[PDB]
Design a protein around this ligand. Structure first.
Ligand SMILES: *[C@@H]1O[C@H](CO)[C@@H](O[C@@H]2O[C@H](CO)[C@@H](O[C@@H]3O[C@H](CO[C@H]4O[C@H](CO)[C@@H](O)[C@H](O)[C@@H]4O)[C@@H](O)[C@H](O)[C@@H]3O)[C@H](O)[C@H]2NC(C)=O)[C@H](O)[C@H]1NC(C)=O
Ligand SMILES: *[C@@H]1O[C@H](CO)[C@@H](O[C@@H]2O[C@H](CO)[C@@H](O[C@@H]3O[C@H](CO[C@H]4O[C@H](CO)[C@@H](O)[C@H](O)[C@@H]4O)[C@@H](O)[C@H](O)[C@@H]3O)[C@H](O)[C@H]2NC(C)=O)[C@H](O)[C@H]1NC(C)=O
Ligand SMILES: *[C@@H]1O[C@H](CO)[C@@H](O[C@@H]2O[C@H](CO)[C@@H](O[C@@H]3O[C@H](CO[C@H]4O[C@H](CO)[C@@H](O)[C@H](O)[C@@H]4O)[C@@H](O)[C@H](O)[C@@H]3O)[C@H](O)[C@H]2NC(C)=O)[C@H](O)[C@H]1NC(C)=O
Lengths: 396, 396, 396
């Protein structure tokens, strides 16, 4: 039956006017100009590849000094007086109250132990990658008709007589990677496969995180001990911060650079300047009547967003229930996408029958204000649906 | 010399009857029907891509409550009486016996500390990915001759006059990834790059694991302390379970969905419903006498499984020593595979000489009952060999 | 304008003499011989793929036994006497001096605790992967003119009349992976995604590391306690070494084998014997005057290395400032590379104008003696620059 999922052409090579087959750096453009005989001008322009990363913003990674202080007062109870470290942003406290052999002179009590972090200094911003999308802008002008589109990696553009396909194993960054920028985005980031998430301890990568909703403080896994002169508190645990431990071995981690980067709340956009990342590009110009666009179809698709579940800004994603009506075709195998005002975040291939169908699409990314709509090609539903906030909370 | 490792054709494009070049979603089929002139019917059917993951079954991940109880009895010795927590599936015990200042009234002893987990609830099944294989079923009918085969990704099918090649960077899942299904497989899983393996502590991802051979209990890394009234036990360590720590930040991890999934002891089979994963498909129909199958060869290959070492169900794999006899050809460069009744798990390219050769193939996956045989194309040895059980034991 | 970044050709398929399109194992060669009519001999030889991994050498991973000893002497002070474990390569010490109820008989003192590791045995060498590069040697002989080059994956070779392109999702190993060889390289390695780097504790993968600059000892995160007869030291912490914990579950990790491997200080070179890794190969022989090499250009490029910053042997890399003069062309979009005597480590695509330009290239890898030069094609600067030593130190 009919289907538009195949993005490509059927051709007779004998009838092909021109074929291009080359490898191009991701960071390179390409321009080709030849006059086609009848003279007909012909222009093929491919732009630099653009990386689109849906990111979770993690805030500022913090450096700090580890401190422990004892406070022994002979007065009654431990809670009745408070202690100097309790003004710190992050402190962990243990109180040895009404226990014993340990009384210093003049005291016939409370022994307050306190570990806290001060000299807090931001060392860079961190982002966790939800999804990655690689696109290139391609413009084709055959005579007086121009066609421009943004082509995804491993996808093809089909015009009445030109087919342009890209194929590239471009994938240095991975989803759920953690990007750390010690400076402005322009100066590049560091990829960290290890970054604390479910069990952030002091000294872990990402231990102290200054977020917009306040500070996020690491647990101290060491053990306390009361020494018995006035008692002194002792802590057996990690003293050195996660930042200092990473910088000491910093050259162990993978960097990645960014040219002209643009950033929003949930998305990072740049061009990778590494000229070694190459994809394969194939262009075929074939003006014969037998040059068939494989995606041609007389089918019509009506879209309505039925329901939504799941979260925005999540590597788990959201699930979008679509009501897809099909007319003018007995069946039609196609792709239905989840898109908002900005762009799309996921697609599902279904086999549609005459009449109404129900189609569920899993999207990944988006923000609080994204109104995700069911989309086909450039046709989306009239209405969109907001998703739930993502669960990204330390348990502490 | 001769060689069948190249899966493809040499053609004259002028003599090509038809060429198809398109990108297709992994989750999409494709059908093409054109009448070839002489009329000759021609049908090209490509099916959805099927993901084959050799998995290590890890059992049920468990949620639990952390408990600590003290038991002080004045009677002699600590071992002589046992304690209530010792019926729990997972408990860790420390006994302060015959030590000191700490005696409560009426006692002129044993102080039993016990941390244990109860309210154990299964929260999902977990699997570690050994290997990944992406296949598509392709059927070609030129006139009255039909050819169907399952093509691996980045491989080609060659018929007397048709060449079909697939090229796809399809690889979202990675080997040694950990898949967690909070529900039935149908409802999808979560990818976890961090999952405890060599040092499972309480609070780690995968801390409490209910396996078929019984329970697998996490270590508690905290420290004990006897407080001195009857003595009270104190524990400085993580109280919150790994499950609760992950759910609190669940939206941080990558999901993956599965359509019509099928599961065995060591293998998970499904179709990825994400329509954004696209591979490149190229078909060439060329009926000219100069259309040469590059893998054509008059060579004959005899197979015998010599020995085996290594383990089934292991990402390290097993090594299969093959005795490969070659006749009717001076040399022959080919691929020798390790396959069982179900399918194949690895292949090795060698350069064979006239007579007997020894060829070692590394396979990954399989199960206890798999009888791995040396195979060439569809020809395998008569006899197979069982492999060793995999070493997948916590040290505890 | 002009550009040589596109490695490929523009052709008329009708005028094509011969086209090859096949998939080949990475571990396979290929040879094709046909006589071209006028007879003209034609030879196309493709060699096995070669993996080039820039590695950071980590030294010998060590197995050990965990020991704890108490030393109580009644004499004055703890420092005045030293203790037997202090000859061990790795020991961690805690001294309970001048504290209290605990005095054994004949003593009216010092209680020395000592945890140490002995029976140290090397269990294998470990390497962290900086970067990966996949190359194949390809030779083309059309009549009396031969052209040989080493082609990178996803790149094309262009001769006056032949175009050879490779496209392959070949990427089992990943950058910043950790390779462990329990034996000689020939016998294969194990990939470890978890390998301690910023917080190496006893029991972590890679806990005890014998490096050329001496030993690297793990921290012991447990807690000490003085028991009160002469006092006994107690340690609550992990007793079992990282090696023993991995071997107990060894079959959980991914292996990779190596044929004829060659190793230097900063680079590992081999051929992957897995015959399932396949890339796509396309050859086009087209001797028509319209067969245009897309990289043809009359431009000339002068090179001078301006400055360098960053480190050799680092997954973060070094930044190379190049002075690139352009003559004979108004503009020229090209690739400028960072290479030393051995090979290249990175490239940057720029748009050059008439006259002098400044171009910054990020390289990854190299060694202490590498003199990195700015390069274009096979033309490099006369002078090179040394980079800084990488920061790869445990904080301890
Ligand atoms: C591609 O990305 C790379 C990583 O994102 C970029 O590397 C960065 O390049 C900058 C610019 O040179 C370096 O900054 C330099 O730092 C050194 C040393 O300073 C360090 O030490 C002091 C003292 O402890 C400390 O206070 C600093 O904060 C630093 O930690 C200075 O001497 C220089 O003058 C300059 O400030 C970065 O260090 C470096 N990043 C890393 C991780 O090494 C690279 O430049 C990018 N290249 C391009 C072309 O975009
Ligand atoms: C693709 O895969 C995704 C992940 O595998 C799928 O996401 C899952 O979708 C189901 C169906 O809606 C969700 O189940 C819902 O859960 C919410 C909330 O329940 C949670 O909280 C309660 C209370 O704490 C707890 O008891 C539960 O166990 C849950 O933890 C309910 O309100 C709903 O009625 C429904 O039960 C899953 O939560 C969700 N998974 C995740 C990880 O979020 C997705 O549906 C798949 N899509 C397709 C098309 O296959
Ligand atoms: C591809 O790579 C694989 C991994 O690098 C290779 O697997 C290795 O193959 C060798 C050769 O057979 C095995 O060595 C064998 O070990 C067993 C058991 O010995 C173990 O136990 C003892 C006692 O505890 C201990 O002392 C040893 O050190 C071992 O830990 C012996 O019975 C055999 O005689 C032989 O020595 C390796 O064990 C195995 N590696 C792993 C991780 O299992 C594989 O051979 C490679 N194949 C090719 C074709 O290159």
């Amino acid at each position: 039956g009919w289907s538009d999922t195949a993005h490509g052409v059927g051709e007779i090579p004998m009838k092909t006017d021109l074929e291009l087959d080359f490898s191009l750096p991701s960071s390179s453009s390409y321009s080709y100009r030849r006059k086609l005989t009848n003279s007909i001008p012909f222009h093929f322009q491919m732009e630099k590849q653009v990386i689109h990363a849906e990111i979770q913003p993690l805030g500022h990674w913090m450096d700090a000094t580890f401190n422990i202080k004892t406070a022994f007062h002979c007065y009654g109870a431990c809670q009745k007086y408070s202690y100097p470290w309790q003004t710190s942003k992050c402190f962990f406290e243990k109180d040895y109250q009404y226990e014993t052999g340990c009384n210093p002179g003049d005291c016939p009590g409370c022994t307050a132990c306190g570990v806290y972090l001060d000299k807090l200094k931001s060392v860079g911003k961190a982002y966790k990658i939800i999804s990655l999308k690689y696109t290139r802008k391609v413009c084709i002008q055959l005579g007086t008709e121009q066609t421009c589109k943004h082509i995804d990696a491993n996808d093809c553009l089909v015009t009445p007589s030109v087919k342009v396909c890209i194929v590239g194993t471009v994938s240095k960054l991975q989803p759920s990677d953690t990007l750390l920028f010690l400076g402005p985005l322009e100066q590049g980031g560091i990829i960290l496969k290890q970054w604390c998430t479910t069990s952030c301890a002091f000294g872990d990568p990402g231990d102290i995180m200054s977020t917009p909703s306040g500070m996020r403080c690491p647990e101290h896994t060491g053990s306390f001990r009361k020494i018995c002169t006035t008692p002194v508190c002792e802590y057996q645990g990690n003293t050195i911060s996660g930042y200092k431990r990473m910088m000491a071995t910093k050259d162990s981690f993978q960097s990645f650079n960014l040219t002209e980067p643009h950033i929003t709340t949930n998305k990072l956009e740049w061009i990778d300047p590494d000229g070694n990342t190459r994809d394969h590009v194939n262009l075929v110009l074939n003006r014969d009547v037998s040059f068939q666009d494989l995606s041609d179809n007389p089918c019509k698709v009506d879209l309505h967003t039925q329901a939504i579940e799941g979260a925005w800004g999540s590597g788990v994603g959201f699930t979008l229930t679509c009501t897809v009506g099909l007319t003018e075709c007995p069946s039609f195998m196609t792709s239905i996408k989840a898109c908002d005002l900005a762009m799309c975040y996921g697609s599902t291939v279904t086999n549609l029958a005459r009449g109404s169908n129900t189609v569920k699409v899993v999207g990944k990314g988006g923000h609080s204000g994204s109104s995700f709509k069911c989309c086909h090609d450039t046709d989306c539903s009239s209405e969109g649906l907001l998703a739930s906030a993502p669960h990204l909370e330390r348990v502490t």
